[PDB]
Amino acid sequence: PPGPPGPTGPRGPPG
Amino acid sequence: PPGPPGPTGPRGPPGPP
Amino acid sequence: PPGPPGPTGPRGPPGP
C-alpha cells in the first residue's frame, strides 16, 4: 500500500 | 517490495501580511 | 509493507 501523505509545507514568505 | 511513497504533503500556510 | 510517507508539501503563498 502507498505511504501516508507527506508533511505540510513550510509557511509562506511575508508580503 | 514496499508500497510507493505517499502523496506530496499539503501546501504550507500563507505568510504574514 | 506500506510505503514511506510522501514528500513535504510546497511552501505556502506569501501574505497579503
Added chain:
Amino acid sequence: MLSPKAATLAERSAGLAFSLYQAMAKDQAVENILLSPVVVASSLGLVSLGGKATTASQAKAVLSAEQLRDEEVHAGLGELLRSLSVTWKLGSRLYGPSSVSFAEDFVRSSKQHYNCEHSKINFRDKRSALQSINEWAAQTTDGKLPEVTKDVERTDGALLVNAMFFKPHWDEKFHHKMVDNRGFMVTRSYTVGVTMMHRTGLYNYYDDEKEKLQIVEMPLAHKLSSLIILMPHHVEPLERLEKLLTKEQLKIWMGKMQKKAVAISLPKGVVEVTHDLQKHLAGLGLTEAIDKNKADLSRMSGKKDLYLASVFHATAFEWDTEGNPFDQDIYGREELRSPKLFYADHPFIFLVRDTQSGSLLFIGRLVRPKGDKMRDELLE
C-alpha cells in the same frame, strides 16, 4: 510512418497551434484552452476543399501552406489525422441548413481526407438542433463529452463541429489509490476543491529560478509521445509565462531538462472545453469564409449565401492514474530519495508532443477545473 508532405503539414499545424493558442490566451473571456493542432488544421482544409478563390486561399494562408498545393494539403492532413488512430476519439460533422444540399464531389472528398460527416439541420427548431449536435458529440465520445454548446448564435450558415476525447496513458502509471482531495488555487483569492493524483518517479525536469517556472516531461505509453507541463512557481495569471512560450524557447527549456526524482501532483478528472474558433481563425486571416457577403463555399453546395457560422472545437481531456505497469524496485533505489515538487494546484500550460516527429497533438491550459469554491480559512 509519416510521408514528407504529412511531416511538412505537421510543422504548419504546430505553428498554427502556437498562433491560435496565443490569440485565445489574449481573449479575456477564455478560461481553459484545449486545442488539437491537426483537427484545427483539418478545419481549414475543409474550407480549402469546399471554397473557391479568396475563401480557399485565405484558409491555405492561415495554415501557412501557401507554397503547398491543394492535393498535398488534403492528403497530408488526412494522413496526419489517420496517424493518431493513449485513448483518442474524434468526430467531424458539417451541419448546414435544411434547405441546402451538399455537393456530391465535396461529400466524397471531405469523407475521404477528413472523415467528415454531413447533416442537414433546421435551425428554427433551436432545442431539437442543439439536441442533435449534443447527441452526436455524446456518441462520438461515448458520453465523455455530453454537450457541445447551449446556444447557436448564427443560424443561417454552416457549422463545423469537432468532438474529441483524449486520455493520456502514462508510460509509468500512478497507483489507483494515490488519489485525494486538495484545493486548486484559480487565483490567490479563489480556491476550488479538486481530486488530485500523486506519483514520485524519475522524470525530465527543469526549474528556471530566473524566470520563476517549472517544466516537467511525462512520457506516455511506450515513449511514443510525452505530455509537457509548464507552471509558474507562484499562483499568477499565465500571461507572463505565455509571453515566454515560443517554439524556440520550448526547445531551450527541453535541452536544459534532466532526469530527476520528481513528486508530481496533478488534478484528476475530465476537463470539458468547447471553443468556437470562428472569431479566432478570422483574426488569423480567415475573414472571407466567416462573412455571409464575401463567403464563397460554392464547391461545398452550389450556393454563395452559404458561409462558415461556427468552428466548434469541443474536447473532453481526462486526467487519470492509468498507464503501463513498472518494476516496483525503483523506490528501493535512492535515485527517488529527496524529490523535486511539481505540485499543480494553480494554473499551468500543457502540450502533448510526438517524441519521434515532434508534432504537437495537443496544446492547452488548465485555469479553472470543475469543482466547488472553497474558503481558504487562513486567507487575509
Added chain:
Amino acid sequence: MLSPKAATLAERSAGLAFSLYQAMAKDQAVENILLSPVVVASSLGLVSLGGKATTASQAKAVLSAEQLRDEEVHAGLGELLRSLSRNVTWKLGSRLYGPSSVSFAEDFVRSSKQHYNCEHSKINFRDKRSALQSINEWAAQTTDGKLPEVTKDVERTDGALLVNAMFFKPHWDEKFHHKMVDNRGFMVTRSYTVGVTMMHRTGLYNYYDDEKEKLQIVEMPLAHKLSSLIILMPHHVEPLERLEKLLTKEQLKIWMGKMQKKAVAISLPKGVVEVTHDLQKHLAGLGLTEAIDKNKADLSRMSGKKDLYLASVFHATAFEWDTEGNPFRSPKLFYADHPFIFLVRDTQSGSLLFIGRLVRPKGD
C-alpha cells in the same frame, strides 16, 4: 466514575485553573504556562488541612468550596487525584519541605498522605547547594529524570515549601508516523523565530475555525478516547492576550459545540517543555494572603509552630510532545508554528487535567 462530591470539586478546580491561568497570563515575566488544576486545588486542600481559622478558610474560599465541609473537600479532591491515575504517561509527586528545626504533626502527616499522597521532608536551607540538590533529585526520581531541576534558587528560607513535580506525555489515539518529523521555524513573535522540531499528521479531527475571532480550535483525542488535548490558536502570529480575553469556561463550551470532524493537517512542535511556577504570589492574588505571610500564618495543625508559613508552591511540569500513540475532504491546516493555548480534558467528567500555553519553545 466520579462521586457527586468529587464531581463538584472537579468544577471548582477547573474554575480555579481559568482564574489562575488568567492571573499568570497578565504577568509579563511569565512566558510558558503549565498548570494541573487538581494538583493546584490539592495544594489549597493541604493549606486547609494544615491550617486553622482564616489561614484555612481563605484556602477553601480560593477553591470556592466554602459551602462544603473540610472532610468532604479532602475526600473529594483525594478521589479526583486518584481518578487521574490510563495508557497516557503521567507521573506526580507532592512533597512538603520544612526547616530542619521543625517536626511535622503525626496526624497531619497521616491525613496529607491519605488524601494528597503528600511526602514530608526536613531540610536545612542554610546549606543552599545541598537543599536545592535534595529538591531537584527528588523531582528527577519522581519524573524519571524528565524534570531534572525545579528551581535554581529558594528566596524564602524560613517557611514551608510545597513542591509538585510532574511529567505528562500525551499518548495519541491515532499516532503520528515516526518519520514525519522535521525542522521548522517557530515564530515566538513576528520578529523572533526559534528553530524547532515539528511532527506532522493528516487525519479526522474535531475542528472549528472562527472567521470572526480569527482563531482555530482542534481536539486531539488521547489513547482510547478517555481524554483529549484541545489546542486554541490565532490564525497568524500574535500575542496570546487577545485570545486569552475570549478564553472562558462558557466560551470553550460554545467553541466545542461548534466543532465538527474534518480532515485536518496538524503540525506541532516535538519535544519536552519544562515549566516551573511558584504559585505563591498568584494564589495570594486570588485570596490566599494569610498562609503566605509569616506574621498572619496559622499552620499550627501542620506542626505546632505559628512562625511556620507557606514560602512557596512550586508547580514544576515536564510536558512531552511526541509521535507515539495507538496504531491506526481537502484538509484544514493546523500549523502550530506560533504561540497557542492547550487544555487536557477528561472526555467523561469534563475535568481539566491541564491548562497551559506554549509561547517560547527550547531552541536557537
